[PDB]
């Protein structure tokens, strides 16, 4: 009877809102702003920077990292976001990672996967389930949708309903 919140955290400009809309476009409800992605599951996103990821990730029942490729300014996993992901893992929060490729990227889906898988592993986040959406996005997107839904099916029994503690007039 509980409601699950998956938060997508990562740099600005990576299309996290459109990713959430794409994930929710094929859901019955379509017939921080949270969007329902099937019963019991809400998806939200926060750009980090500038938000400090730690306090938000602490509220995520599922944590989804959204990461850029190597071409980007800086490096794909900022220290505070890596530390927040390690804290989620330590407490048993399911961890997912996404590379949302987009037209004219230096990387094939295969290269982005291999390099991002290696980066995550090297940062102690090897247990993250990695999704690499092609520029054309698809099979990976549907795998992400189903992984989010199945992680959420399992967590509902640990979590109160959203109304918990509210006097519903």
């Amino acid at each position: 009877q509980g409601d699950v919140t998956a938060l997508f955290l990562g740099p600005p400009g990576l299309g996290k809102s459109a990713l959430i809309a794409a994930l929710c476009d094929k859901d019955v409800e379509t017939l921080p702003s949270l969007r329902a992605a099937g019963p019991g599951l809400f998806l939200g996103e926060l750009s980090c920077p500038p938000a400090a990821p730690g306090p938000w990730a602490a509220e995520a029942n599922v944590l989804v990292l959204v990461l850029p490729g190597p071409e980007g300014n800086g490096e794909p996993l900022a220290p505070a976001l890596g530390e927040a992901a390690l804290a989620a893992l330590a407490r048993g929060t399911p961890l997912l990672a996404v590379r949302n490729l987009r037209p004219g990227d230096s990387q094939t889906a295969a290269q982005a996967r291999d390099q991002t898988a290696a980066l995550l592993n090297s940062a102690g986040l090897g247990a993250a389930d990695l999704f690499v959406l092609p520029a054309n996005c698809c099979e990976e997107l549907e795998r992400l949708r189903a992984a989010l839904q199945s992680q959420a099916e399992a967590l509902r029994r640990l979590l109160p309903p959203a109304q918990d503690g509210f006097e519903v007039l």
Partner: protein, 117 residues
């Protein structure tokens, strides 16, 4: 005006809480009620409410009066962002106008408090 609710929860916790309840109950607004610190009026047992958006501020004041059993010959006042809200607004309208950044609407109440507000 210290708010126990805010003291008890991180800003992020409060944001996700209101966001979840707003997504799940789109015709209702989440409200925190606290009596004015230092005031003489009896306290209220429950602080956290899910209020139908269509009831008026005046009607919500009557719900609060009933919850604290305030005798009819005593006055009650509500205060939202430091001022007296328009009694004929609906709670949905008051929410959209005065909601906290955390997505909750914070309503303080008192009696004819000698010490003001």
């Amino acid at each position: 005006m210290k708010w126990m609710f805010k003291e008890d929860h991180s800003l992020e916790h409060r944001c996700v809480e209101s966001a979840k309840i707003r997504a799940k109950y789109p015709d209702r607004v989440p409200v925190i009620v606290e009596k004015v610190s230092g005031s003489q009026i009896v306290d209220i047992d429950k602080r956290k409410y899910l209020v139908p958006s269509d009831i008026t501020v005046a009607q919500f004041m009557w719900i609060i009066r009933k919850r604290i059993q305030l005798p009819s010959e005593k006055a009650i006042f509500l205060f939202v962002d430091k001022t007296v809200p328009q009694s004929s607004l609906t709670m949905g309208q008051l929410y959209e106008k005065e909601k906290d950044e955390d997505g909750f609407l914070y309503v303080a109440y008192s009696g004819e408090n000698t010490f003001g507000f």
